[PDB]
């Protein structure tokens, strides 16, 4: 697999999400670019149906891990790039404790020259007066580590991760993520060993933009595997 060869330069990104949370429907379109050599993402997202009915931060993890920077002593553990350009499926259930849960299914693959993340999201059992549907979460994001393990019997990977959203009252809302990834095509994919992804995010606004939106900068760097002799 020569999939990592496609991430040598800067690659345009396209994100399209169709959502439905307690019957409240919405769509988000995002565009920008990713630089995997640095593990950098820059994107602007627009809610094309008007007002977004969930807080923008609850969607950050849903809205392209093939742009992570894998160190040279870990290039043999980069599942996401190995499946390219055929792509992989990314599925998650995100359980906000004391509240509802998201179910997502996305396809991450190339369409022409652009890297595309196409997602379907369903939200269920949320409290209408809660932190999610009630818009009680601060417009920021913390740095997190996502531990990755290989699932041999599915030809992909899985991961657990505990996102902490800051609440406007000073408390913290926990979003319990469970994730599985499987390749679209049939090419040879790389199944890693136990490691993790280290992630930072900076959320901002565009002053000349009237629609509901989010400007996102993100850094994703692989770690965990011991460097030694070589």
């Amino acid at each position: 697999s020569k999939g990592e060869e496609l991430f040598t330069g800067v690659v345009p990104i396209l994100v399209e999400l169709d959502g439905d949370v307690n019957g409240h429907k919405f769509s988000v379109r995002g565009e920008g670019e990713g630089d995997a050599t640095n593990g950098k993402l820059t994107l602007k997202f627009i809610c094309t149906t008007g007002k977004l009915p969930v807080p923008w931060p609850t969607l950050v993890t849903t809205l392209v891990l093939c742009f992570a920077r894998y160190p040279d002593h870990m290039k043999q553990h980069d599942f996401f790039k190995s499946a390219m350009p055929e792509g992989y499926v990314q599925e998650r259930t995100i359980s906000f404790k004391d509240d509802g849960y998201y179910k997502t299914r996305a396809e991450v693959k190339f369409e022409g020259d652009t890297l595309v993340n196409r997602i379907e999201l369903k939200g269920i059992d949320f409290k209408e007066d809660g932190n999610i549907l009630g818009h009680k979460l601060e417009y920021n994001f913390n740095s997190h580590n996502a531990y990755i393990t290989a699932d041999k019997q599915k030809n992909g990977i899985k991961s657990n991760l505990k996102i902490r959203h800051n609440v406007e009252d000073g408390s913290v809302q926990l979003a319990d993520h469970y994730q599985q990834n499987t390749p679209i095509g049939d090419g040879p994919v790389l199944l890693p060993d136990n490691h993790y992804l280290s992630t930072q995010n900076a959320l901002s606004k565009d002053p000349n933009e009237k629609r509901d939106h989010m400007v996102l900068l993100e850094f994703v760097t692989a770690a965990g595997i011991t460097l030694g002799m070589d």
Side-chain angles (χ1 to χ4, degrees), residues 76-77 79 82 150-152 155-157 189-193:
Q76 69 277 4
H77 301 269
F79 167 67
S82 73
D151 198 321
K152 195 73 183 61
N155 201 33
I157 57 103
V189 306
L190 256 70
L191 308 176
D193 298 296

Side-chain angles (χ1 to χ4, degrees), residues 4-18:
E4 78 255 62
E5 177 134 310
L6 296 144
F7 301 97
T8 57
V10 291
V11 184
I13 300 179
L14 172 44
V15 184
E16 297 200 286
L17 175 134
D18 277 336

Side-chain angles (χ1 to χ4, degrees), residues 113-128 130-153:
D113 60 338
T114 299
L115 198 276
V116 173
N117 183 24
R118 192 164 284 116
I119 312 123
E120 296 230 81
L121 175 140
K122 178 77 171 191
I124 282 172
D125 283 328
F126 283 92
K127 302 183 182 169
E128 294 281 341
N131 289 318
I132 312 307
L133 288 186
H135 291 282
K136 311 192 180 199
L137 305 178
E138 301 182 333
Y139 188 65
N140 47 40
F141 214 75
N142 292 319
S143 303
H144 297 96
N145 281 350
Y147 295 92
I148 297 187
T149 71
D151 198 321
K152 195 73 183 61
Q153 295 159 331

Side-chain angles (χ1 to χ4, degrees), residues 56-70:
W56 278 109
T58 73
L59 304 180
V60 163
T61 68
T62 298
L63 299 161
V64 288
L65 301 165
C66 42
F67 286 109
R69 183 174 77 87
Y70 272 79

Side-chain angles (χ1 to χ4, degrees), residues 169-190:
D169 74 343
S171 71
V172 154
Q173 169 90 44
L174 269 163
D176 205 347
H177 290 56
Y178 292 85
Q179 170 183 351
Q180 82 172 11
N181 293 59
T182 80
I184 291 177
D186 283 314
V189 306
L190 256 70

Side-chain angles (χ1 to χ4, degrees), residues 4-14 31-43 64-71 75 78 81 110 113-115 198 200 216-222:
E4 78 255 62
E5 177 134 310
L6 296 144
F7 301 97
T8 57
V10 291
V11 184
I13 300 179
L14 172 44
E31 54 180 17
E33 56 180 54
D35 174 21
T37 303
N38 286 309
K40 180 159 105 181
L41 294 157
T42 59
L43 288 127
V64 288
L65 301 165
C66 42
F67 286 109
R69 183 174 77 87
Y70 272 79
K75 299 305 205 68
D78 196 353
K81 293 192 189 61
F110 266 96
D113 60 338
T114 299
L115 198 276
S198 183
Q200 301 82 32
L216 184 52
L217 166 69
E218 182 169 289
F219 289 105
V220 181
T221 304

